A paper describes a structure:
The GH3 [name] from the thermophilic fungus Rasamsonia emersonii (ReCel3A) is a more efficient additive to enzyme mixtures compared with HjCel3A. We also present the three-dimensional crystal structure of [name] from the moderately thermophilic filamentous fungus R. emersonii solved to 2.2 Å resolution.
The crystal structure of ReCel3A is a tetramer composed of two biological dimers. The large number of hydrogen bonds between the protein and the ligand bound in the catalytic centre makes the binding in subsite −1 of GH3 enzymes highly specific. The two catalytic residues in ReCel3A were identified based on homology to other GH3 structures: Asp277 (nucleophile) and Glu505 (acid/base). In the ReCel3A structure, clear density is observed for a glucose unit in the −1 subsite and no indication of distortion from the relaxed chair conformation can be observed. When compared with the corresponding residues in HjCel3A, the plane of the Trp68 side chain has turned almost 90° away from the +1 subsite. The lack of a +2 subsite in ReCel3A could explain the activity profile for the enzyme as a more pronounced cellobiase than HjCel3A. The N-glycosylation chain IV shows the remarkable feature of being buried by the extended C-terminal loop. Two conserved aromatic residues, Tyr720 and Tyr727, on the loop provide stacking interactions with the two buried NAG residues 1201 and 1202.
Residue numbers in the entry:
A (entry chain A): 21 to 855
B (entry chain B), D (entry chain C): 382 to 477
C (entry chain D): 287 to 381
E (entry chain D): 763 to 855
């Protein structure tokens, strides 16, 4: 009856191959010098709010190693000062520009680097976007594995090229906030929600962007809060051992989400590497690792090779991106902005200089501005845009136009919607150095050309709006929709959005301005799609522009699009007519009594546009759609088969697991006398040589066979996964099978950007009618022609076969479609076999 | 016409420095500048939103009654200090 | 030179536009007449294609879209002898 | 003071469009702009290198004699157009 | 260890020169270098690992690379002549 996660053991050890060879060697040479206690310090955080970063593992003072600092977020450095606030991942997706994604990554890594941070906790591939109303989808990219996967890779490379370890999260099937840590809303449930998906759905959708992350060199992966077939993601041997470490060949380390850790021995043997923030609960003074992991090795329950592999994987990530080259000590504190304060914030101890107020922003405002602008999406345009610059009177309407009256950083974790929306709420945030509003920037631009101006930001003041809209040349109306992480609730939205409609009373504002102004331009700052069926086709709405969450330069980047200086992107999600059109409703009430609620991914691959395509549901605006300020035409499609060598499943065996030092004795793992033990601080040491007493675990003492699955302790050479062999999967999957060329021509009067898109029909009865497999972003002058060349890999034309546990090109004929949205695909050609 | 220039010059020269212990002039090297008070911000009903300026909903630039005129716009202390502060690489918050 | 370790002759002729080559037709004849083992020329080809596959030209290949001899959009493919008129510059911005 | 602004505004407003069948205004996205002529560039002897501007060695911004003044600098046509073209990712060359 | 003893953030290029020791060898030869950014008063531990090749000579007789008997001296600093620190390479115990 209840979904089950099969076991896979032992936990694959790092192999020192390919692009990881130099980093592995340095990691080994480092960890070879270590005692058991020092090794345990790399694995275990020191407790909630016990040091300076959001997550922090202990030091190794004998070798002058300060430990590692894990800091949020995916869009900048969380909880500090003199940093930049970048656009949200959903905006990056909307650019469809890998090189802008790359440049944002470099810029974020640079700020993390200058603050002394070792690991930046992003980017986000999970949530992917199963449900449009899930609260954290804006942190990620798009409900499409190819688009998201490419943006993950580009982002990770940027980050890590700037000398900071990236962290792909949240692994995996973390697709809603409700019940992510179990009990909430007065319901008593024993355990977190459980995402239940089948092996094909996992492979063709959710895991794919993780393979891209891993293939791109990502140094770490964060496992999620939810369960997967009723094993917690940070305890799940199938996802961490089989999927991530065996099949995807991941060579870095896996950390817990904060409180995602649920066992000491189980989790260690099921493939976990780092415990964050290191305690069982926030400031419990207890850890599943720390002392317990020292004991678990000492008493033989966990092999030495495994705790050595955790450490070797951690230091591999460190060396891989060059952390030994960039010496910046931690110069900030995540808990307060005071210059002076306690090192051990959770227990008010160890007063010192904890913030140096270092300014790391450099020229990063320029990439934020560009992404802001390029990421805007022109969904509708009947002449309303671009603006000329010489409108005589310009009205700006709606609360979303102006600022937060509590200050730009006035509501903690951005847990409010008090003005313009440039970032959702939760852990995925940063403090702004300022926020330029649409009101501020538009007024400056209109006045630069002696236009007159009024800004009406009280959404209650409908008479005032009507009157000013009666008189203005162009009415710019602003509306938003917000969401975030589930530990914060805003107006009945518990992370997840309680509906898909507009916030702040903006619907009525749109209605009264439309009625009085025949040149109304509406701008949306939404975390994702909203239902717009009731106003979008109003003849007085002459343009609609989605601007997402643009970070700190919101209004500056907006005016560049509005006045035609920068060209818009394409929506990275579907704008449907009704909620039910999206499918995948949120589980907001327990559906399993008092047990873990059960989220069955019955839809399979069929989310966002794949669903709309399958059931012939007509969206208002389809995935990949966006207007330009000019026109483009697509001609001369040519699909050229490449004579790929046939697919070679991997075979052979791993090396045997290794121990890098000699075995430790309990006698060498006591608290040193010169240590003042901080209350609730997580240490690696033992009270005494009595191992039972030092662990203090009610269930201590069983032999492994009784509580741990078969082969968890097998250190002997293992079968290489036939779908594995290298980071990202079997290299034979990435062999080119086809070369697709097509001509794109700017047939209009002005220069503009196109996002050409390549879709594949895999052809079988249960496939989606078309899946994205390629894209680019090009700029063409009027009349200019461009030959777009994409090379399709074998993986691009494969399906996941649960029978053979590998990727297979089915016999069904494949059709390549080329064009500029998921539904505007005027050219198609079959993929022929090589003569 | 060019009448903004005279409005600006009278604005500036009419201002009166009643007390100054050190706080003015601003140096242009301030790292974080806070603006506090509803009078630094915009009227949310729009610049000509209250008939005869008969309200006190933001910054005050004119009293109410027959002694008034409609504004072509109103540059607030908040908008301008933000601009000046950012142009010298300063951080900023406005709490109104 | 073949036997001494050379693998590719650039620009391919003896002198510029001489119409003659130390290889080309000469290399075909040298292999056919026994003077150069088949393993040598096969190793020339293998080493060339090894470089090609090492960097992944099979992944990243795009057709040539420019011309080294002129910036004109139209001109001769065979610049040296004014022959084969075609579109030789697509003016692609790679910056 | 800020007299650059009036100089700039008069500079611009004094220009006379004598002929036009498509060439002006520029779009700000042309891919390659050429600038041609010794009148586009600098006086190689410096902006105040000729006594009473008694020469024609670059762009002409003033005639010679007593009706002159020393320049603080002179933004040439070449300088400004290169900056504008490059600001919109166009290519450029100036032959003087 | 490299320390920024001044008032602004700055870039150093630490360099490592080796004297191979023989009478026909150059007084010294570059064998390591890096570029580091240090804030004011900040220290950096600069670690370089020399290889066999970095302390060998080419011997025509044996047609191979040899580490000669002569004492090798490692110098560290920030140009070919500003080399305040030096030490011989000793055998492993
Ligand atoms: C999905 O999830 C999202 C996220 O959780 C969720 O988002 C929420 O949506 C809410 C619904 O939109 C939204 O709340 C609305 O906010 C509107 C604006 O609120 C501000 O302004 C009002 C009004 O301020 C006016 O008026 C007061 C006097 O009352 C005065 O003090 C003010 O100074 C100002 O004066 C102006 O008007 C005067 C005349 O009224 C005039 O004389 C003056 O010169 C001047 O012009 C403030 O009171 C607030 O505190 C805010 O500052 C708000 O207008 C709207 O209220 C109306 O609807 C509510 C029901 O939703 C009623 O409770 C309420 O009484 C109002 O009811 C009137 O209007 C509705 C339809 O609009 C109508 O059906 C009613 O019968 C009633 O009609 C009468 O008034 C209207 C015009 O108001 C006339 O046209 C009629 O003829 C009648 O006379 C809401 O309160 C909330 O902000 C938002 N939350 C967040 C966090 O984003 C969303 O709800 C979810 N969606 C769904 C579908 O569930
Ligand atoms: C050396 O030092 C060590 C360090 O201190 C010390 O380690 C400790 O060892 C003790 C035992 O001596 C451990 O305690 C046990 O922990 C077990 C695991 O609990 C956690 O995981 C559960 C799910 O586990 C599945 O998945 C794991 C991987 O994630 C696998 O390792 C497991 O084998 C198991 O696999 C099965 O399921 C998989 C799918 O999930 C599947 O792939 C696989 O094939 C297989 O089907 C979680 O459920 C559990 O959470 C529950 O309990 C916690 C509180 O404990 C709550 O917070 C949760 O909400 C939830 O209710 C953990 O996260 C436990 O299973 C085991 O429990 C059983 O026995 C105890 C009695 O001693 C009972 O209290 C309990 O009810 C259980 O009873 C069941 O089994 C018994 C048989 O013993 C049977 O009689 C009975 O009928 C019943 O069915 C136990 O608590 C402890 O975890 C270790 N501590 C640390 C810090 O690591 C070690 O002992 C020392 N060694 C020596 C030699 O001295
Ligand atoms: C959440 O729950 C869901 C539901 O359980 C999980 O989804 C399941 O995941 C399973 C993997 O863990 C997967 O298992 C496979 O099933 C295949 C056939 O299943 C069919 O029936 C079911 C149910 O009745 C259908 O619903 C389904 O759609 C299928 O029609 C088997 O073929 C697979 O067996 C092979 O792999 C397993 C391990 O995965 C091995 O133990 C086993 O030995 C098999 O491997 C050998 O044989 C195959 C045969 O083709 C070879 O190709 C292969 O390379 C191996 O070959 C060696 O051995 C042979 C001799 O046997 C020798 O000649 C050769 O030389 C080699 O040495 C496997 O059992 C489920 O199908 C899948 N179900 C669904 C609905 O998706 C999901 O993953 C869970 N998720 C999480 C995160 O926990
Ligand atoms: C695992 O991680 C944890 C968390 O990071 C590590 O715990 C920290 O360990 C360090 C080093 O032991 C410790 O720092 C000491 O704090 C002491 C207690 O307040 C200080 O008294 C001590 O100062 C002395 O040593 C300094 C250099 O080591 C000197 O510069 C200083 O003047 C002091 O020197 C006097 O005392 C020493 C003996 O202590 C003596 O030899 C000298 O001659 C002189 O008289 C340290 O700075 C942190 O306090 C620990 N953190 C916490 C929270 O407890 C732990 O070490 C890691 N585990 C492993 C195995 O590596
Ligand atoms: C090593 O890991 C294990 C988990 O695998 C971890 O176990 C936890 O230990 C604490 C302390 O023994 C357990 O606490 C119990 O909690 C229940 C809560 O309702 C209480 O009834 C018990 O209370 C009595 O004993 C205390 C002993 O310190 C007294 O202080 C108290 O007054 C009571 O008399 C007891 O506190 C906890 O349940 C387990 N958790 C699990 C999930 O098993 C252990 O703490 C870890 N070791 C280290 C060093 O971190
Ligand atoms: C294969 O490789 C060989 C070299 O290994 C290459 O040999 C060259 O062939 C050309 C002839 O095809 C030789 O050129 C000749 O040089 C002599 C000078 O001693 C000239 O007399 C020849 O005539 C020239 O002048 C004439 C005046 O009336 C003209 O009518 C005539 O067209 C010539 O301009 C002629 O140039 C050359 O010497 C050898 N080179 C060497 C280096 O040995 C042979 O051509 C190659 N085969 C192929 C198919 O490319
Ligand atoms: C700036 O943003 C702030 C954060 O969103 C806004 O503050 C919020 O304002 C709304 C509307 O006034 C309040 O909602 C009301 O809540 C009460 C009861 O809530 C109580 O319980 C919560 C804990 O769950 C507690 O935090 C509160 O203090 C209350 O005791 C309802 O009964 C009402 O119907 C209504 O929904 C928010 O509670 C309030 N939040 C916070 C965090 O202060 C503020 O209005 C914004 N300011 C501007 C100028 O826009
Ligand atoms: C910058 O402008 C100055 C001033 O106009 C230029 O110097 C001038 O150059 C002209 C042409 O070479 C000189 O003409 C000469 O006149 C004498 C008679 O006095 C005659 O015998 C010569 O054969 C010739 O025609 C002129 O005298 C000279 N004036 C001065 C004041 O030096 C200069 O060439 C310009 N430089 C550049 C780099 O553009
Ligand atoms: C579209 O906009 C025009 C205004 O440009 C609206 O026209 C006004 O409508 C009101 C209410 O019916 C009339 O009393 C006014 O005479 C109209 N004004 C002008 C200047 O013509 C029009 O109604 C709007 N359309 C919709 C469907 O709301
Ligand atoms: C605004 O429009 C609504 C209908 O959507 C209408 O009932 C109301 O009277 C209008 N209010 C004003 C002030 O125009
Ligand atoms: C370690 O010993 C102290 C007494 O010294 C005791 O309070 C504490 O509970 C012991 N810790 C564990 C984990 O048993
Ligand atoms: C453990 O793995 C080996 C393969 O290496 C296999 O022979 C054995 O069946 C496994 N043991 C159990 C109990 O499943
Ligand atoms: C704005 O007004 C001032 C004063 O008339 C004038 O100097 C300036 O040129 C005007 N700008 C435009 C673009 O019309
Ligand atoms: O703050 C660190 C972590 O906090 C958790 O609550 C979130 O789910 C993670 O996405 C985040 O990286």
């Amino acid at each position: 009856n209840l979904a089950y996660s099969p076991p896979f053991y032992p936990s694959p050890w790092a192999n020192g191959q390919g692009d990881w060879a130099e980093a592995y060697q340095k990691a080994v040479q480092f960890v070879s010098q270590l005692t058991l206690a020092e090794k345990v310090n790399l694995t275990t955080g020191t407790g909630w709010e016990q040091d300076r970063c959001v997550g922090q593992v202990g030091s190794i003072p004998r070798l002058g190693f300060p430990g590692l600092c894990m800091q949020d977020s995916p869009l900048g450095v969380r909880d500090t000062d003199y940093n930049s606030a970048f656009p949200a991942g959903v905006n990056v997706a909307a650019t469809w520009d890998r090189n802008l994604a790359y440049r944002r990554g470099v810029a974020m890594g640079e700020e993390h680097r200058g603050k002394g941070v070792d690991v930046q906790l992003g980017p986000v591939a999970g949530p992917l976007g199963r449900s449009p109303d899930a609260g954290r989808n804006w942190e990620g990219f798009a409900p499409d594995p190819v688009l998201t996967g490419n943006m993950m890779a580009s982002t990770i490379q940027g980050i890590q090229d700037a000398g900071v370890i990236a962290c792909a999260k949240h692994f995996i099937l973390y697709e809603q906030e409700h019940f992510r840590q179990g009990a909430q809303d007065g319901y008593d449930i024993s355990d977190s929600i459980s995402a239940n998906a089948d092996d094909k759905t996992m492979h063709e959708l959710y895991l794919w962007p993780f393979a891209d992350a891993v293939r791109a060199g990502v140094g770490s992966v964060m496992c999620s809060y939810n369960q997967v077939n009723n094993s917690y993601a940070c305890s799940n041997s199938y996802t961490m051992n089989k999927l991530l470490k065996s099949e995807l060949g991941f060579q870095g380390f896996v950390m817990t989400d904060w409180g995602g850790h649920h066992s000491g021995v189980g989790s260690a043997l099921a493939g976990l590497d780092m415990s964050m923030p290191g305690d069982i609960a926030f400031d419990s003074g207890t850890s599943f690792w720390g002392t317990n992991l020292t004991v678990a090795v000492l008493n033989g329950s966990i092999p030495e090779w495994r705790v050595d592999d955790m450490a070797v994987r951690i230091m591999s990530a460190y060396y891989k991106v060059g952390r030994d080259r960039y010496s910046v000590p931690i110069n900030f504190d995540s808990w307060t902005l005071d210059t002076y304060g306690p090192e051990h914030y959770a227990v008010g101890q160890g007063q010192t200089k904890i913030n140096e107020h270092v300014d790391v922003r450099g020229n990063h405002a320029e990439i934020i501005h560009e992404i802001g602008a390029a990421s805007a999406v022109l969904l509708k345009n009947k002449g309303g845009l671009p603006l000329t610059g010489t409108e005589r009177f310009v009205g700006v309407f709606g609360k979303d136009a102006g600022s937060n009256p509590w200050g730009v950083n006035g509501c903690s974790d951005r847990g409010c919607d008090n003005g313009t929306l440039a970032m959702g709420w939760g852990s995925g945030t940063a403090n702004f150095p300022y926020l330029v509003t649409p009101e501020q920037a538009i007024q400056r631009e209109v006045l630069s050309r002696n236009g007159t101006f009024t800004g009406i930001t009280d959404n209650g003041a409908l008479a005032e709006m009507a009157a000013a809209a009666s008189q203005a040349d162009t009415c710019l109306v602003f509306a938003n929709a917000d969401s975030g992480e589930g530990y914060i609730t805003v107006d009945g939205n518990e992370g997840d959005r309680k509906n898909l409609t507009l916030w702040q009373g903006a619907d009525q504002v749109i209605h009264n301005v439309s009625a009085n102004c025949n040149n109304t331009v509406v701008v949306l700052h939404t975390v994702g799609p909203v239902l717009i069926d009731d106003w979008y086709d109003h003849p007085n709405v002459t343009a609609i522009l989605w601007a997402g969450l643009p970070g700190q330069e919101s209004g500056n980047s907006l005016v560049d699009v509005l006045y035609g200086r920068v060209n818009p992107g394409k929506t990275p999600f579907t704008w449907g007519r009704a909620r039910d059109d999206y499918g995948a409703p949120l589980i907001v009430k327990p559906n399993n009594g008092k047990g873990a609620p059960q989220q069955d991914f019955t839809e399979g691959i069929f989310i966002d546009y794949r669903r709309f395509d399958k059931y012939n549901i007509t969206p208002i605006y389809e995935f990949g759609f966006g207007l330009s300020y000019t026109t483009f035409e697509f001609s001369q499609l040519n699909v050229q088969p490449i004579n790929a060598p046939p697919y070679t499943p991997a075979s052979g065996f791993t090396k045997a697991a290794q121990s890098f030092g000699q075995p430790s004795n309990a006698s060498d793992n006591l608290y040193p006398s010169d240590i003042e033990r901080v209350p609730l601080y997580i240490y690696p040491w033992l009270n005494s040589t009595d191992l039972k007493a030092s662990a203090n675990d009610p269930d201590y003492g069983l032999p492994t066979e009784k509580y741990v699955p078969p082969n968890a302790t097998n250190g002997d050479p293992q079968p290489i996964d036939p779908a594995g062999g290298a980071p990202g999967g079997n290299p034979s999957l990435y062999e080119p099978v086809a070369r697709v060329t097509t001509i794109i021509t700017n047939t209009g009067k002005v220069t503009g950007d196109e996002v050409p898109q390549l879709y594949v029909s895999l052809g079988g009865p249960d496939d989606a009618p078309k899946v994205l497999r390629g894209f680019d972003r090009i700029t063409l002058a009027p009349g200019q022609q461009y030959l777009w060349t994409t090379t399709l890999t074998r993986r691009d034309i494969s399906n996941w076969d649960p029978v053979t546990q590998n990727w297979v090109v089915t016999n069904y004929t494949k059709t390549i479609y080329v064009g500029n949205s998921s539904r505007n695909l005027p050219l198609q050609a079959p993929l022929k076999p090589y003569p």
